[PDB]
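Section handout, structural biology tutorial.
Before the tutorial, make sure you can parse a SMILES string by hand: atoms, branches in parentheses, ring closures as digits. In the record below the ligand is ETQ, and the chain has 432 residues. In the tutorial you will relate the predicted structure tokens back to the input. Do not try to memorize them.
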Amino acid sequence: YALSYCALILAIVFGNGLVCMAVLKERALQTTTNYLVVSLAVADLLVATLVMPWVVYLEVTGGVWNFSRICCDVFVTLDVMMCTASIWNLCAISIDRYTAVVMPVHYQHGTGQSSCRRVALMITAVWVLAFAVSCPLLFGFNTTGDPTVCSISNPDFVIYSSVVSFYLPFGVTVLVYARIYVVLKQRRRKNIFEMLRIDEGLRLKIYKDTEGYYTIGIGHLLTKSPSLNAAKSELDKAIGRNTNGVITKDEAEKLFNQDVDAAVRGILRNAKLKPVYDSLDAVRRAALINMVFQMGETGVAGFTNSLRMLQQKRWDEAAVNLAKSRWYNQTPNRAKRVITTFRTGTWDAYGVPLREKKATQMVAIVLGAFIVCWLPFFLTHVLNTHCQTCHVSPELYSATTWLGYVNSALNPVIYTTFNIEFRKAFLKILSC
Ligand SMILES: CCc1cc(Cl)c(OC)c(C(=O)NC[C@@H]2CCCN2CC)c1O
Ligand SMILES: OC[C@H]1O[C@H](O[C@H]2[C@H](O)[C@@H](O)[C@H](O)O[C@@H]2CO)[C@H](O)[C@@H](O)[C@@H]1O
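Predicted structure of the complex:
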């Protein structure tokens, strides 16, 4: 393992040096996921420039350390800190996907805004957790039986780190990804009910809506009066018990299922909206209900141009038509999802986007790469220092460590493999 390590050294500063270059420059690649990928790329850049040079020195000698014990402590803590930073970032990303999968319509909205003061706080956390875990070595816990041997030999620390460095964040991510699978495997279609839940949202206490009117449950307007009494009075009336401002989920649901009925009926009694709704399909019908839910039977009746266009089955035209509206400027995201539903006649507007599936797939493999690279070590290093049946030759140990450092240079090879836009930006910086 003589020049091999030096090859790896450059491979790591090369790939992850690019990964950073791509994100910082490429507008498209500047997303919350990627920003965490940067910090993970930084964990590998530091490893290659502050830890592996010393790993290459201890390799040239037969495991003899001629430098200050203070210089050994720094070296060993950094090695722990980066590896701690890696696995934990990796977990931060896992949760990031979990939210993009479980709550996909909200994820897109909450990544398109001042969503850096979160990312900041996640990266920060991960590094500060990284440091605290490693710092004991710095303040004396790097004890060995000979000063020329520079290694983590402490029986207590090794157990601690193994849990906090690996078996905990690994256990988190594995159980997160367990749930990612469960959800994506459970491809339940959507309907009018799940649609409006997303768009309207569900609340149990009374609240003032966008117009300033008292509301509760899934967009149910209680009263246009400025009285919180009248609101509760109408709320009781609609449920059949003295609520006092609060309801249950299931109450909220039944109240909603009525409003949807009233919405259907309201349209069939309308002399403008009925012929449209008859010539629409189960799904596209659902988007008309949705507009009338948002805007009432007569407001929706005022898109004369678009209502005809939907009857004449001109879908694409109607969509470009409805964008030009005051409805769109007011609530532009909800419009985009209703208009897409009309255009396509599908619920891909409320699904998990392709872009995100492909990310969630990618970072499953980056995680896979890790556990394959680092699990060998954490089993060997634990069993070498807590020993009874030490079938643990130093030849093996050098491999398990070698394998662990190989991991760093792999990430950018995975990012080019599966992500097209990285692959695009990488050849863009290399082509100059
Ligand atoms: C089990 C807890 C544990 C956790 C972490 Cl993050 C560690 O650093 C990777 C170690 C560890 O042995 N480091 C020092 C060794 C010797 C120099 C290189 N390096 C191996 C990568 C370690 O024993
Ligand atoms: O506009 C018809 C609907 O009015 C209420 O719900 C609205 C209301 O306009 C307001 O709270 C807000 O803009 O959203 C919700 C629906 O989007 C009624 O409670 C509904 O039954 C009507 O469909």
